[PDB]
Design a protein around this ligand. Structure first.
Ligand SMILES: CCCCCCCCCCCCCCCCCC(=O)OC[C@H](COP(=O)([O-])OCC(O)COP(=O)([O-])OC[C@@H](COC(=O)CCCCCCCCCCCCCCCCC)OC(=O)CCCCCCCCCCCCCCCCC)OC(=O)CCCCCCCCCCCCCCCCC
Ligand code: BCL
Ligand code: BCL
Ligand code: BCL
Ligand SMILES: CC[C@H]1c2cc3[nH]c4c(c3C)C(=O)[C@H](C(=O)OC)c4c3nc(cc4[nH]c(cc(n2)[C@@H]1C)c(C(C)=O)c4C)[C@@H](C)[C@@H]3CCC(=O)OC/C=C(\C)CCC[C@H](C)CCC[C@H](C)CCCC(C)C
Ligand SMILES: CC[C@H]1c2cc3[nH]c4c(c3C)C(=O)[C@H](C(=O)OC)c4c3nc(cc4[nH]c(cc(n2)[C@@H]1C)c(C(C)=O)c4C)[C@@H](C)[C@@H]3CCC(=O)OC/C=C(\C)CCC[C@H](C)CCC[C@H](C)CCCC(C)C
Ligand SMILES: COC1=C(OC)C(=O)C(C/C=C(\C)CC/C=C(\C)CC/C=C(\C)CC/C=C(\C)CC/C=C(\C)CC/C=C(\C)CC/C=C(\C)CC/C=C(\C)CC/C=C(\C)CCC=C(C)C)=C(C)C1=O
Ligand SMILES: COC(C)(C)C/C=C/C(C)=C/C=C/C(C)=C/C=C/C(C)=C/C=C\C=C(C)\C=C\C=C(/C)CC/C=C(\C)CCC=C(C)C
Ligand SMILES: COC1=C(OC)C(=O)C(C/C=C(/C)CCC=C(C)C)=C(C)C1=O
Ligand SMILES: CCCCCCCCCCCC[N+](C)(C)[O-]
Ligand SMILES: CCCCCCCCCCCC[N+](C)(C)[O-]
Ligand SMILES: CCCCCCCCCCCC[N+](C)(C)[O-]
Ligand SMILES: CCCCCCCCCCCC[N+](C)(C)[O-]
Ligand SMILES: CCCCCCCCCCCC[N+](C)(C)[O-]
Ligand SMILES: [Fe+3]
Lengths: 302, 281, 240
C-alpha cells in the first residue's frame, strides 16, 4: 500500500502559535495549553490559547450553573448516595412544571420551578455564547457566517424549550433535562402528534441530516483525494485556483455532470447543515399549535 | 460541454476493463465500462419496478411499492409477483451501486487522485446491504428487508423500530445518532469558517488560514486545522454509517427484546443493584 | 391551512436557494467551451453570477470572478476523433509536458504566505525551532523508487509553519541537486522512504525550484502534478 492521509506519518512541532492579533484584546487571551502528540496524528497537537473576556465568563458561569442545577437535582433524586447517583445517572430527570401551572413562574421548586431556573441559566448561556461567536469573528475582521449558522441550531433549541411551550400555553410542553427522559419525550412527542413521519418538515430535516453526512463524506474524501496537490489549503485555492481544485471539480463533473468551486462547496456545506434545524424547527413549531395530528393533516392538506 | 480548464485532463487511460472501448464522455459525464454497467443495472432495475407497478395496479410514485418475499419463503426464491421482483431489483441495485463506485475508481485513475471517494461511498453501499442482505440472511428470511416504496419504507422503519420498544434505547443507534448530529455541526462550522475567512468584513482583505485557526482557538480553545477538519468530516459521516449498520445487524440476531431492557445490566451490577432509593430502588 | 402555506413556501425558497448555490458555483470554469476552445452553444439554464472581488492580503492584489479565463500555458494534446467527447492524446512526454494526471495550473509564481507575510512553507533548517516531534524522522534515509532502485537521500523536510505539518521531503539526487517530494506521495519506512509514483530514472525530471529556500504556488503545482502523473505514466516500470 501507499499513503492514504488519514493519519500523518511524521509530526513536526515548533513554537506555540499565539494567533493573529487584529482588533483582539490580547489581555483576554490565555496562554497555550499543552501539546497532544496523540491528537497530532490526526489533527493539530496544540491546545489553546482561548479567549475569555466578559461575555465568555458570563457564558461559562451561566452554563455551569445550568449543569450544576441539574446535577444537584440528580443528587437529590439519588438520596445523596453516590452509588445510587452512578447507578441511575441516565434515569434521573429534571422535569418542567405540570400543565396546571401553565406558564406561571410560581411553580413549586420541586415541581418545575427548578426546571425554570435551570432553563433561565441555559438561555443566557447559549445566547451569550452566540454573542461570542459574533464578537470573535468581528475582532478578527471576519464574516459572521458562524454566528449566522449557530442561529439555525438555536432556532430548533428555542422552538423546543421556549417558543412552542409559550404558544401552547404551558411549560409542561418543554423538554426535560435527563439522558433517557429526553428520548422518552421525543418518542412521546411523535406519538401524540400522529407520527412525525407524516410531518413533511421532519422528512426535509431528515433529507438534510442524511444529506449532511453524504456531503461531508463527499467533500472530506474529495479534499483528501487531492491533498497530494495541496487541496486542503482551500483559502489559497479560492484566491488562486490550482490543479487540486480542478481535479476535485472534474471528478464530480465526470461522475454526476455538475460540480462546485472551492468556495462554493462551502456554501453547499453551510446550507445543507443549517437546513437540518431550520426545517426541523418549523416542523416542531407547527406541531400542536397548528397541526394536532400529522397523519390526519396528510390525508387533507388542511 | 467542457469547463474552461478541463481539456488538459481529458486524456486516455485509467480504465479498469475494456482498454479504450468505453474511454469517452457524453457531455460532462464520463462513461467507462462501469458507466455502461451502471446503465444496464439501473435500466433493468427501473423496468422491473415499472413491471411491479403494473402488477400492483398503480403508476402513482407515492403508491408504487416493491415488497420482499413473505417470511414463509425464507431465503429462497419467490414468484415474481410475490417477492421475486424485489429480489431481482435488489441484485440490479447492488450491481448499479457497485458499478457506480468502480466508475468513480476509473475516474480517480485518469485524474491521478486518491481513491477516498468511492471508498467512502462503499460505506453507504455496505449499509444498504446490511438492510437488504446481511441482516435478512442472518435472520433467515428476505422478508425482513425493507420494501422499495417512498412511504412503505417508512412504515418499515416505524414497525421495525417499535418491535423493540422505543428504538432510541439501542446503544449503537445512540452512537450513530451522535455521529450524525456531530457531523452536521462540523459541516456547518467548516462551511462557515472558510466562508468567514473568504468573505470578511466589507472592504477588508481576505483572511488567512491563520485567522481561521485563531477564530476557533479564541472560541473553543482548539483548532483541528485544515487537513484535520476534512479528515474529521469523513470520520464522523463514515462512523455514523458504520454504527447505523452495527445497530441494525445486532437487532433481531443477538438482541430480541425491548432495547430499554438492555440497560438493566448496568443497573443490576451487584455492588449497587439493591441499594434503596433513586429511580431503580 | 398554515402548515400547507409553510411547506409550499419552503419549496419555493429551496428552488431559489439551489439557483443561488448553483450560480455561485459557476464563478470558475464558465462559460463552457467546445473542445476547440470556443464558447459552447449550450450553457445550461443557470446564468453566470455578477462578479465579486476578493481583496488578496499582503498587497498581492485582487481577484474578480467570474472573469475572462485562459490556461496561460501550452497543452501538448491532440484530438483523437472528429466528433466531440473523445480523449485528447499527448503529443509528447505527458509527464514533461504537464498534461493528463501530470497537469499543472499556472498559479502565481510567488510562495504562499502566512498571516504575517512570511513564507508559509520553509525547509525545517530555516524554520525556528521546528523539529520532528513524533514518528520516524525521514532525514538521512535513502529514497527508493517503484523500480526498487535508490534515487537519492532525504536531506530535509519542508514544513508548513502555520499548520505545523510536514509538506515535502527534500531529496538529494546523485548529482548533488535536490527535488521536493510531496509528503502525500511518499511512504516513510524504518530503513527508507519509498515513492510508488516514480521509478529512480524519473526523479531527475521532477521540476526544480528557482530559489533553494522557498517554493512558489506554480512550482508546487508542477511538482505535485508531475509526481501524481507517474502513477499513470511510469506504470511500464511498476511492478510496485
Ligand atoms: C424561520 C426563522 C428562522 C431564522 C433563524 C435562523 C436563520 C439562519 C439564516 C442562515 C444564514 C447562514 C447563511 C450564511 C450566508 O451565506 O449569508 C451571509 C450573510 C452576510 O454575512 P456577514 O458576515 O454579515 O457579511 C460578510 C460578507 O461580506 C457577505 O457574506 P456572503 O457573501 O457569504 O453572503 C451573501 C448572501 C446575501 O445576503 C442575504 O441577504 C442572505 C440572507 C438571509 C436570509 C434569511 C433566510 C432565512 C431562511 C428562511 C426560510 C423560509 C422558508 C419558509 O448570499 C446568500 O446567502 C443568499 C440568499 C439566498 C436566499 C434565496 C432565496 C429564495 C427567495 C425566493 C424566490 C422567490 C421567487 C422567485 C421568482 O448573512 C445575512 O445577510 C443574513 C443576516 C440576517 C440578520 C438580519 C438582522 C435584521 C435585524
Ligand atoms: C436510511 C435508513 C432507512 C431510511 C429511512 C428514512 C427516513 C426516516 C426518511 C427517509 C427519506 C428518504 N429516503 Mg429513506 N431510508 C432507507 C434507505 C433509503 C434508500 C436506499 C437504502 O436505497 C433510499 C434511496 C432512500 C431514499 C429516500 C428519499 C425518498 C427520502 C429523502 C432521503 C435523502 O434526502 O437522503 C439524503 C441524500 C440526498 C439529499 C441525495 C438525494 C437522493 C434522493 C433524493 C434519492 C431519492 C430517489 C428515490 C425516489 C428512489 C428512486 C430510485 C429510482 C427508481 C432510480 N431511503 C432505510 C430503510 N428515509 C425521508 C422521506 O421524506 O421519505 C418520504 C425520510 O423521512
Ligand atoms: C419515536 C421518535 C420519532 C422522532 C421524533 C423526533 C422529534 C420530536 C424531533 C425529531 C427531530 C429530528 N429527527 Mg426524528 N423521529 C423519528 C425518527 C427519525 C429518524 C429515523 C426513524 O431514522 C431519523 C433519521 C430522524 C431524524 C431527525 C432529525 C433530522 C431531526 C433532528 C435534527 C437535529 O440535528 O437535532 C439535534 C440538534 C439540536 C436539538 C440543536 C441543539 C442546539 C444547541 C443550542 C445546543 C446547546 C447545547 C449546550 C447547552 C450543551 C452542550 C454541552 C457541551 C459539553 C458544551 N428522526 C421518530 C418517528 N424527531 C427534531 C426535529 O426537528 O423534528 C422536526 C425533533 O424535535
Ligand atoms: C419509530 C422509528 C424509530 C427508529 C428506528 C430505526 C430503524 C428501524 C432504523 C433506524 C436507522 C437510523 N436511525 Mg432511527 N429510529 C428512531 C429515531 C431516530 C432519530 C430521532 C431524532 O429520534 C434519529 C436521528 C435516528 C437516526 C438513525 C440513523 C442512525 C439511522 C439511519 C441512517 C442510516 O442507516 O444510514 C445508512 C444509509 C443508507 C442505507 C443509504 C444508502 C443508499 C445508497 C447505497 C444508494 C442509493 C442511491 C440511489 C437509489 C439514488 C437514485 C439516484 C438519484 C438520481 C438521486 N433515528 C425511532 C426511535 N432507526 C436505520 C439504520 O441504522 O439503518 C442501517 C434503521 O434501519
Ligand atoms: C446547523 C445545525 C447543527 C449545529 C450547528 C452549530 N452548533 C453550534 C454552532 C453551530 C454553527 C456553533 O457556532 C457553536 C459552537 O461554538 O460550536 C463550536 C455551536 C454549539 N453547539 C453545541 C452543541 C450541540 N449542537 C447541536 C447540533 C447542531 N448544531 C446541529 C446539528 C447539538 C445536538 C445535535 O443535540 C448539540 C449538543 C455546542 C458545542 C456549541 C454551543 C456552545 C454553548 O451555547 O455553550 C453554552 C454553555 C457553556 C458555555 C458551558 C456549559 C458547561 C457544560 C454543560 C459542561 C461543563 C464543562 C466546561 C465546558 C469545562 C470548563 C471548566 C473549567 C472552569 C475548568
Ligand atoms: C457513507 C456516508 C454517506 C454517503 C456517502 C456517499 N454517497 C454518495 C457518495 C458517497 C461519498 C458517492 O460518491 C455517490 C455520489 O455520486 O454522490 C453524489 C453517492 C450517492 N449516494 C446517493 C444517495 C444516498 N446516499 C445516502 C447516504 C449516504 N451517502 C451516507 C449517509 C442516502 C440516504 C441517507 O438515504 C441516499 C438516498 C446517490 C446520490 C449517489 C449514488 C448514485 C448511484 O449509485 O447511482 C447509480 C444508480 C442509479 C442512478 C439508480 C439505480 C436504481 C436501482 C436499480 C433501482 C432502485 C432500487 C432502490 C433500492 C429503491 C429505493 C427506494 C427508496 C424509496 C427506499
Ligand atoms: C472542493 O471540491 C469539491 C468540488 O469541487 C470543487 C465539488 O464539485 C464537490 C461535489 C459537490 C457538489 C457539486 C455539491 C452538490 C452535491 C450534493 C448536494 C450531493 C447530492 C447530489 C445529487 C442529489 C445529484 C446526484 C446525481 C447523480 C447520481 C447523477 C445522475 C446521472 C445519470 C444520468 C446516471 C446514469 C449513469 C451515468 C451518468 C453513466 C454515463 C453514461 C451515459 C449517459 C450513457 C465536492 C464534494 C467537493 O469537495
Ligand atoms: C457529579 O455531580 C456534579 C453535581 C458535580 C456534576 C454532575 C451534573 C450532572 C450529572 C448534570 C447532567 C446534565 C444532563 C443530563 C443534561 C441533559 C440535557 C438535555 C438532554 C437537554 C435536551 C434538550 C434541552 C432543551 C431543548 C432546552 C431548552 C431550553 C430553552 C430554550 C430555555 C428556555 C428558557 C426558559 C424556560 C426561562 C424563561 C425566562 C426567560 C429568559 C424569558
Ligand atoms: C470548523 O472546524 C472545526 C474546527 O476548527 C478548526 C475544530 O477544531 C473542531 C473541533 C474538533 C475536535 C475533534 C475536538 C477534539 C479535540 C480536543 C480539543 C480534545 C470542529 C468540530 C470544527 O468543525
Ligand atoms: C468543541 C471542541 C472543544 C475544545 C476544547 C479545548 C480545551 C480548551 C483548553 C485550552 C485552555 C488552555 N489552558 C490550559 C492554558 O488554559
Ligand atoms: C442543499 C440542498 C439539497 C436539497 C435536498 C432535497 C431533498 C428532498 C427530499 C424529499 C422530502 C420529502 N418530503 C417528505 C418532505 O415531502
Ligand atoms: C433531488 C435529486 C434530483 C437528481 C437530479 C440530478 C441533477 C443533475 C443535473 C446535472 C446535469 C446537467 N446537464 C443536464 C447539463 O447535464
Ligand atoms: C420503488 C420506489 C418508488 C419509485 C418512485 C418513482 C420515481 C419518481 C421520482 C419521484 C417522484 C417525485 N414526487 C414528488 C412526485 O414524488
Ligand atoms: C440536491 C441538489 C440538486 C442539485 C442538482 C442541480 C444542479 C445541477 C445542474 C448543473 C448544470 C451543469 N452545468 C451545465 C451548469 O454545467
Ligand atoms: Fe473544505
Amino acid at each position: 500500500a501507499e499513503y492514504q492521509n488519514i493519519f500523518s506519518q511524521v509530526q513536526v512541532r515548533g513554537p506555540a502559535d499565539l494567533g493573529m492579533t487584529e482588533d483582539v484584546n490580547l489581555a483576554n487571551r490565555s496562554g497555550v495549553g499543552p501539546f497532544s502528540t496523540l491528537l497530532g496524528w490526526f489533527g493539530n497537537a496544540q491546545l489553546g490559547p482561548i479567549y475569555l473576556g466578559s461575555l465568555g465568563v458570563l457564558s461559562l458561569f451561566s452554563g455551569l450553573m445550568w449543569f450544576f442545577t441539574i446535577g444537584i437535582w440528580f443528587w437529590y433524586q439519588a438520596g445523596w448516595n453516590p452509588a445510587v447517583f452512578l447507578r441511575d445517572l441516565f434515569f434521573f430527570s429534571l422535569e418542567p412544571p405540570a400543565p396546571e401551572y401553565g406558564l406561571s413562574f410560581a411553580a413549586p421548586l420541586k415541581e418545575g420551578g427548578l426546571w425554570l431556573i435551570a432553563s433561565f441559566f441555559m438561555f443566557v448561556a447559549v445566547w451569550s455564547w452566540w454573542g461570542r461567536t459574533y464578537l470573535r469573528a468581528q475582532a478578527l475582521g471576519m464574516g459572521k457566517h458562524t454566528a449566522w449558522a449557530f442561529l439555525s441550531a438555536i432556532w430548533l433549541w428555542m422552538v423546543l424549550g421556549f417558543i412552542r411551550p409559550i404558544l401552547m400555553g404551558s411549560w409542561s410542553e418543554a423538554v426535560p433535562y435527563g439522558i433517557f427522559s429526553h428520548l422518552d419525550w421525543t418518542n412521546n412527542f411523535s406519538l401524540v402528534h400522529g407520527n412525525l413521519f407524516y410531518n413533511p418538515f421532519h422528512g426535509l430535516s431528515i433529507a438534510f441530516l442524511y444529506g449532511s453526512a453524504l456531503l461531508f463524506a463527499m467533500h472530506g474524501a474529495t479534499i483528501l483525494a487531492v491533498s497530494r496537490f495541496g487541496g486542503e489549503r482551500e483559502l489559497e485555492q479560492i484566491a488562486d485556483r490550482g490543479t487540486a481544485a480542478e481535479r476535485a471539480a472534474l471528478f464530480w463533473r465526470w461522475t454526476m455532470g455538475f460540480n462546485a468551486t472551492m468556495e462554493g462547496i462551502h456554501r453547499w456545506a453551510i446550507w445543507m447543515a443549517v437546513l437540518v434545524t431550520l426545517t426541523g424547527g418549523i416542523g416542531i413549531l407547527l406541531s400542536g399549535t397548528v397541526v394536532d395530528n400529522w397523519y390526519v393533516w396528510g390525508q387533507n392538506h388542511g | 460541454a467542457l469547463l474552461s480548464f478541463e481539456r488538459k485532463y481529458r486524456v486516455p487511460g485509467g480504465t479498469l476493463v475494456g482498454g479504450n472501448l468505453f474511454d469517452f464522455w457524453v457531455g460532462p459525464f464520463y462513461v467507462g465500462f462501469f458507466g455502461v454497467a451502471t446503465f444496464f443495472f439501473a435500466a433493468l432495475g427501473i423496468i422491473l419496478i415499472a413491471w411491479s407497478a403494473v402488477l400492483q395496479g398503480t403508476w402513482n410514485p407515492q403508491l408504487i411499492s416493491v415488497y420482499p418475499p413473505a417470511l414463509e419463503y425464507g431465503l429462497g426464491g419467490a414468484p415474481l409477483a410475490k417477492g421475486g421482483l424485489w429480489q431481482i431489483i435488489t441484485i440490479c441495485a447492488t450491481g448499479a451501486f457497485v458499478s457506480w463506485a468502480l466508475r468513480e475508481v476509473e475516474i480517480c485513475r485518469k485524474l491521478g487522485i486518491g481513491y477516498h471517494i468511492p471508498f467512502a461511498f462503499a460505506f453507504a453501499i455496505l449499509a444498504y446491504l446490511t438492510l437488504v442482505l446481511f441482516r435478512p440472511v442472518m435472520m433467515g428470511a428476505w422478508g425482513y428487508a425493507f420494501p422499495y416504496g417512498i412511504w412503505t419504507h417508512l412504515d418499515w422503519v416505524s414497525n421495525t423500530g417499535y418491535t423493540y420498544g422505543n428504538f432510541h434505547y439501542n446503544p449503537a443507534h445512540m452512537i450513530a445518532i451522535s455521529f450524525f448530529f456531530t457531523n452536521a455541526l462540523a459541516l456547518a462550522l467548516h462551511g462557515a469558517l472558510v466562508l468567514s475567512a473568504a468573505n470578511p468584513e466589507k472592504g477588508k482583505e481576505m483572511r488567512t488560514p491563520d485567522h481561521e485557526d485563531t477564530f476557533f482557538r479564541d472560541l473553543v480553545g482548539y483548532s483541528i486545522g485544515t487537513l484535520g477538519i476534512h479528515r474529521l468530516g469523513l470520520l464522523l459521516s463514515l462512523s455514523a454509517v458504520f454504527f447505523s449498520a452495527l445497530c441494525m445487524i445486532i437487532t433481531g440476531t443477538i438482541w430480541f427484546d425491548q432495547w430499554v431492557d438492555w440497560w438493566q445490566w448496568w443497573v443490576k451490577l451487584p455492588w449497587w443493584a439493591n441499594i434503596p432509593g433513586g429511580i431503580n430502588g | 391551512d398554515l402548515a400547507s402555506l409553510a411547506i409550499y413556501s419552503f419549496w419555493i425558497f429551496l428552488a431559489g436557494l439551489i439557483y443561488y448555490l448553483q450560480t455561485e458555483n459557476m464563478r470558475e470554469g464558465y462559460p463552457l467551451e467546445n473542445e476547440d476552445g470556443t464558447p459552447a452553444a449550450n450553457q445550461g439554464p443557470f446564468p453566470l453570477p455578477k462578479p465579486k472581488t476578493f481583496i488578496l492580503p499582503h498587497g498581492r492584489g485582487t481577484l474578480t470572478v467570474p472573469g475572462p479565463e485562459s490556461e496561460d500555458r501550452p497543452i501538448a494534446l491532440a484530438r483523437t476523433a472528429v466528433s466531440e467527447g473523445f480523449p485528447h492524446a499527448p503529443t509528447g512526454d505527458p509527464m514533461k509536458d504537464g498534461v493528463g494526471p501530470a497537469s499543472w495550473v499556472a498559479r502565481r509564481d510567488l510562495p504562499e504566505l502566512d498571516g504575517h507575510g512570511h513564507n508559509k512553507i520553509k525547509p525545517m533548517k530555516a524554520a525556528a525551532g521546528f523539529h520532528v516531534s513524533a514518528g520516524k524522522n525521514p532525514i538521512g534515509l535513502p529514497v527508493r523508487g517503484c523500480d526498487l532502485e535508490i534515487a537519492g537521500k532525504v536531506v530535509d523536510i519542508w514544513v508548513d509553519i502555520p499548520e505545523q505539518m510536514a509538506r515535502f521531503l527534500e531529496v538529494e539526487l546523485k548529482d548533488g541537486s535536490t527535488r521536493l517530494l510531496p509528503m502525500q506521495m511518499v511512504k516513510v519506512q524504518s530503513n527508507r522512504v519509498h515513492v510508488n509514483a516514480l521509478s529512480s530514472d524519473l526523479f531527475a525530471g521532477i521540476p526544480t525550484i528557482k530559489s533553494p529556500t522557498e517554493v512558489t504556488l506554480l512550482e508546487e503545482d508542477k511538482i505535485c502534478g508531475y509526481v501524481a502523473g507517474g502513477l499513470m505514466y511510469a506504470a511500464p516500470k511498476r511492478k510496485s
